[PDB]
Design a protein around this nucleic acid. Structure first.
Lengths: 65, 169, 188, 286, 129, 266
RNA sequence: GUCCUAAGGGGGGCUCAUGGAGAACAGAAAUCUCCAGUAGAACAAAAGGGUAAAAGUCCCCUUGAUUUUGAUUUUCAGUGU
RNA sequence: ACGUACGACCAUACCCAGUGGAAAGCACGGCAUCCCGUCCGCUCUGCCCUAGUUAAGCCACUGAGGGCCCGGUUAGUAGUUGGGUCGGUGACGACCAGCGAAUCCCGGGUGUUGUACGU
């Protein structure tokens, strides 16, 4: 995880970095091997949390592509 | 040098104008009757300035016109001067060599009367050019037509008399 | 032919401006013949161009890119006058002074966005501007009006322009404050 | 009142001479030659494409302070050396002329003792760079299917790096944003002209003879155009500087000087002008 | 000396499925052969960036294209257990398809030109069987 | 500023930390000789991209009143000016004017020698491309005066004229033209302006052998009247601003080769 | 009191105010045609030289209403991603 | 020398009219299947270079009326700064210098030029 971009409930929750459902986070996509049109290596992208980490013990996210 | 084939007078275009002055169903009828007369869609003209006396407003469609080129222009001008009985005035011809007239009833041309569209009159204007008119119209190297190549009032009157067998009074 | 020249005083260089300075005197011949005069001047020019080319090709790093073979130049060192004065901080306005005294922090760029979520319609809408929420109801087909405000309303005016009236009043107050701040800054 | 008076004539400011002649768009020229994304002080080349009634003119041009310079020039009437004798202004001839100019540029540069500072400062990890030029279409309209882009396509195929997109080539579809390379190949090898030949041969034989009267006279069928243009491309890539002699009268430069000065009307001298003025004064007195 | 390629020459469409094999002609770079998952092979004129021929007849993905060492034949092996030989100057299939494999034919290899005997060429096909 | 275009113009004319390349305005007086006009044409040809040109006659004597010059600098955003004049006392004069904050910073007069002047068209060589910067060579002992004089002022003014656009990189193919200004200390010394094109030859070593060929123009000047800057305005003009990309050095704080901020303890 | 897929940006095409000669109603003033028209129109500013295949005017595309990153500049930070 | 294409100075090149143009090139031109665009294949775009024609464009020469551009003259003169240097109470006059006009008048002119390919 690189950063927490937007918690949908509160900017205070975004500032505290709370990982809940629907949260937009920044992730390191170096392992995915994404190359841009100019040949640069895209190593940071946005994902959305699709689960409840407080209930599951794990953070599940889907890349916003 | 006047016997050169490139100086031959011919019709450049024929413009048919209906200045209704009021927007709406009347203007649509004028556009429709222009459409059957020409065979192509007409152009709506908007008023430049507003005049309270004429009851017009700026940027309001008040007139309609069609530009026709080729032998279609020749046959429409033949129809118009058939209505005018091949008789024109010296008052009509311009100093630049163009001419024109106006009719009051479009039924006299040969269009069957339809009471849905009504009765309209029209202004016919014919422009006359010699070959070589591309010089002042093309995008690249646009220039001015020379003085000897320009068409005079006497030349276009003589052309009309010789071609339509008409009379100018 | 040699590619190095020897002179009593060495050249100085400013490779940012591609400038070569020769402090050695130009011993111009004291004759009137143009061919030998320009020959001497061309010899001086050739010497300067030679040392400049040598300096550029030896003491600048070279990169071969798809654009070509580029020399990386140092920033210019020759002291030259500016055309305009160095930018300075603006005079502090009344709001800026008040916020500095009261510890009022600037709003974040996410906080000051022109976007909000309308719950009742369930859509995203703008707070101001074209179709903004500050003009809510001006195109609403049905508006209930209170009888007291309708009676106190002047003749000819409608309820559909009240929000535009309020917006115009607020804009006029804001522009009056802006003009006062501009006049005070101009006096300063 | 007279609008063209002395005050109007004194206050009038003329445009540029080539703007009055209607040959140069200086607004586009300024951005073509005096604008650069990078400031590496490098020379810039443009491929100037111009069209006449009977010829195509392609040039490789740099801009200097006292006038432009031509690096190489190719003309569509030089295709007669490579076998193209008809349709010297069609899209395929535009393609072949652009290809010929590209091959001539590469042959002149040797990309097919004085030396350059690039060779002086070349490093170990350095590769050969392509020749680069920007297209100059002049006052022509840049629509889909124009022959300026055929010239550009031929030059890019010949080996000049010209920045371009593919949305103005014949066969491009704007609704799908996809180029039909079948239609592109048809236009490159002149299949549109050939298809017009069979269309006229089936519909209007008199129009077919009137438009293609040279084609039947030279006995060039519609089905041979693709082979003819392919063989022309191969000959262009083989020998870019093949000499072509025209059927025009041939004299030396001094003989042409004499022939033109034979028909030049000399300007009258001051003595002759004063004599004519005195004769006019005498005629006015009489 | 071979200089490094640095820019796109031509992007040529025409295949409806991903391209699974590509190979230049041994004569020159003007002719290129590709085989794809749309059950077809294609020849490309790389000078003008244009298609030349479309070889059709396989019913599986063309897993391999291979030019003959002299350049007079193009052999294509496909997922339909078949190998076909085509004439690259006309785009026509030479005789019938080669049958006998039980599963997908994955690779092809021509006999070297100096080893050809009995007035014929020899082709080796490796399959999943 | 209502329109975004006028807003862009005001933002372009606004003072900046990194200044724009300077613009030169070429203009002439009520009377001006043909040789002076040819010299102005040659200088404008050398500086086409960052110049603007007037074409009327201006009733301006710059060393008496320069309010009109300040107004022209204000209107055209031109910080350098070349002013042409002719006279009985001064037959061919080029007045170089340098501005600061739309006010006259300093001025210098050049008297052109008419008999030795040669234009660019009189040399049948390949010319400089439009927009390409030439390199500069200043030769002689007149430019090393310990006190600021007319020759140091002329050196600074010609450097500012032939700067072009600054750049951190340059292609090796952009080193083909050189402008040489020669002047010696001493009856009046002659400041000679020449332009040459540069050819390179093999010499058997790594460095090439440079040979020159004259490009034009050929100018000979005598330095005339001089208006020096006010010391306070000169100090404000010679102040140097620092870009945000120039890090202020902090004690015991550094950047490593990976970009980490590193502190040092002792 | 009304109206607007907002302004802006890019690209392309065109030339304006006016005058003369002409065209049923149409007559100083409606619309259309030609010729002449250095801008005398429009848009900005307050030129003592703004803009004419445009900076004017109509089409096409975007309209996403204030992007991301920064060890760098300035200020701030008891909520220092 | 002439023509064409890109140009450089941007009226000595502009506004109006007449006369002529070998060669080739430009140009007017012919036709609307395909590419493309219009109310109108007028413009733009595609195809033909065959046929007609120098009528216009273009070029050269000439002609008026304006305009424009050089050089001299005005003239080192008006005017403006300096008690500068001499008087004048001072103002101001002359003298000494420094900067420095324009009108009028006279004479000349109505385009030079680079690259490339051709005649």
């Amino acid at each position: 995880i690189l950063s927490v971009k937007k918690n949908p409930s509160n900017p205070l929750y975004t500032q505290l970095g709370v990982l809940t459902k629907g949260t937009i986070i920044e992730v390191n996509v170096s392992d995915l091997g994404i190359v841009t049109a100019s040949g640069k290596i895209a190593w940071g992208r946005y994902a959305q949390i699709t689960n409840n980490p407080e209930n599951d013990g794990c953070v599940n996210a889907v890349l916003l592509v | 040098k006047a016997q050169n084939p490139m100086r031959e007078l011919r019709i450049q275009k024929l413009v048919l104008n209906i200045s209704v002055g009021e927007s709406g169903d009347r203007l649509t009828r004028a556009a429709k009757v222009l459409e059957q007369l020409s065979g192509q869609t007409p152009v709506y003209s908007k008023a430049r300035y507003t005049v309270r006396q004429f009851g017009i407003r700026r940027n309001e469609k008040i007139a309609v016109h069609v530009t026709v080129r080729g032998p279609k222009a020749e046959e429409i001008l033949e129809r118009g001067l058939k209505v005018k009985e091949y008789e024109l005035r010296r008052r009509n011809f311009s100093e630049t060599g163009n001419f024109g007239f106006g009719i009051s009833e479009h039924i006299d041309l040969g269009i069957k009367y339809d009471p849905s569209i009504g009765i309209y009159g029209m202004d016919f204007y014919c422009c006359m050019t010699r070959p070589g008119e591309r010089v002042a119209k093309r995008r690249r190297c646009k220039s001015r037509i020379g003085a000897s190549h320009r068409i005079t009032r006497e030349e276009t009157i003589r052309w009309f008399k010789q071609r339509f067998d008409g009379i100018v009074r | 032919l040699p590619v190095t020249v020897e002179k009593p005083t060495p050249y100085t260089f400013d490779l940012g401006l591609l400038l070569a300075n020769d402090p050695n005197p130009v011993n111009v011949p004291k004759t009137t013949d143009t061919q030998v005069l320009e020959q001497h001047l061309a010899s001086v020019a050739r010497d300067g161009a030679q040392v400049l080319i040598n300096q550029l090709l030896t003491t600048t790093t070279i990169t071969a890119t798809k654009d070509g073979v580029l020399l990386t130049l140092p920033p210019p060192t020759t002291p030259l006058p500016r055309e305009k004065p160095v930018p300075q901080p603006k005079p502090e306005t009344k709001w800026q002074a008040f916020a500095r005294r009261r510890g009022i922090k600037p709003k974040t760029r996410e906080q000051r966005r022109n976007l909000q979520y309308n719950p009742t319609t369930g859509q995203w809408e703008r707070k101001w501007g074209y179709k903004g929420a500050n003009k809510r109801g001006e195109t609403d087909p049905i508006i209930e009006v209170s009888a007291a405000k309708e009676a106190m309303r002047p003749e000819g005016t409608s309820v559909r322009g009240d929000k535009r009236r309020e917006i115009r009043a607020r804009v006029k107050k804001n522009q009056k404050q802006m003009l006062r701040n501009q006049r005070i800054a101009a006096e300063k | 009142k007279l609008v063209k008076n002395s005050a109007y004539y004194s206050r009038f400011q003329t445009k540029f001479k080539r703007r009055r002649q209607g040959k140069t768009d200086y607004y586009a020229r300024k951005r073509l030659i005096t604008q650069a994304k990078n400031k590496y002080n490098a020379p810039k080349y443009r491929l100037v494409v111009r069209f006449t009634n009977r010829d195509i003119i392609t040039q490789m041009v740099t801009s200097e302070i006292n006038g432009d310079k031509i690096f190489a020039a190719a003309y569509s009437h030089e295709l007669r050396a490579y076998g193209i004798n008809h349709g010297l202004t069609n899209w395929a001839a535009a393609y072949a002329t652009g290809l010929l100019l590209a091959r001539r540029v590469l042959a002149k540069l040797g990309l097919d003792g004085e030396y350059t500072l690039t060779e002086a400062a070349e490093t170990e990890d350095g590769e050969r760079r392509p020749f680069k030029a920007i297209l100059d279409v002049g006052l022509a309209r840049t629509s889909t299917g124009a022959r300026v882009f055929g010239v550009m396509k031929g030059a890019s195929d010949g080996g000049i790096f010209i920045p371009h997109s593919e949305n103005r080539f014949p066969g491009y579809d704007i609704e799908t944003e996809e180029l039909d390379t079948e239609v592109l190949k048809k236009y490159i090898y002149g299949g549109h002209v050939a298809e017009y030949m069979e269309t006229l041969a089936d519909d209007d034989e008199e129009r077919y003879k009137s438009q293609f009267v040279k084609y039947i006279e030279d006995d060039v069928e519609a089905d041979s155009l693709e082979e003819l243009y392919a063989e022309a491309h191969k000959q262009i890539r083989a020998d870019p500087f093949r000499k072509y002699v025209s059927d025009a009268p041939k004299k030396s430069k001094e003989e042409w000087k004499a022939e033109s000065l034979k028909y030049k009307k000399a300007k009258l001298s001051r003595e002759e002008r004063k004599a004519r003025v005195e004769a006019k004064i005498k005629q006015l007195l009489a | 000396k071979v200089h490094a390629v640095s820019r796109l020459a031509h992007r040529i469409p025409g295949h409806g499925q991903p391209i699974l094999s590509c190979q230049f002609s041994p004569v020159s770079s003007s002719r290129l052969a590709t085989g794809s998952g749309d059950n077809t092979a294609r020849i490309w004129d790389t000078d003008s960036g244009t298609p030349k021929f479309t070889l059709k007849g396989h019913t599986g993905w063309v897993l391999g294209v291979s030019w003959s060492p002299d350049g007079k034949y193009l052999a294509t092996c496909s997922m339909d257990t078949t190998v076909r030989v085509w004439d690259p100057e006309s785009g026509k299939q030479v005789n019938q398809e080669f049958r006998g494999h039980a599963k997908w034919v994955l690779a092809l290899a021509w006999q070297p030109y100096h080893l050809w005997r009995d007035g014929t060429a020899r082709l080796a096909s490796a399959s999943k069987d | 500023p209502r329109n975004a275009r006028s807003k862009r113009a005001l933002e372009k004319r606004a003072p900046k930390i990194v200044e724009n390349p300077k613009t030169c305005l070429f203009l002439r007086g009520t009377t001006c000789s043909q040789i002076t006009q040819d010299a102005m044409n040659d200088l404008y040809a050398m500086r086409q991209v960052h110049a603007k040109r007037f074409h009327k006659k201006n009733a301006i004597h710059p060393f008496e009143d320069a309010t009109s010059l300040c107004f022209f600098s204000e209107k055209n955003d031109c910080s350098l000016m070349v002013f042409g004049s002719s006279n009985k006392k001064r037959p061919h004069t080029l007045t170089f004017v340098r501005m600061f904050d739309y006010k006259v910073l300093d001025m210098l007069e050049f008297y052109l020698d008419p008999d030795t002047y040669r234009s660019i068209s009189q040399f049948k060589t390949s010319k400089i491309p439009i927009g390409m910067r030439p390199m500069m060579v200043f030769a002689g002992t007149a430019f090393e005066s310990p006190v600021p004089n007319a020759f140091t002022m002329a050196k600074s003014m010609l450097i500012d004229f032939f700067r072009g656009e600054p750049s951190d990189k340059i292609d090796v193919e952009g080193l083909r033209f050189v402008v040489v200004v020669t002047a010696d200390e001493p009856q009046k010394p002659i400041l000679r302006l020449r332009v040459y094109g540069i050819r390179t030859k093999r010499s058997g070593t790594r460095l090439p052998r440079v040979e020159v060929e004259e490009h034009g123009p050929r100018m000979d000047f005598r330095l005339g009247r001089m208006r020096e800057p006010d010391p306070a305005m000169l100090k404000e003009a010679m102040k140097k601003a620092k870009t945000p990309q120039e890090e202020r050095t902090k004690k015991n704080i550094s950047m490593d080769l990976l970009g980490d901020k590193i502190g040092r303890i002792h």
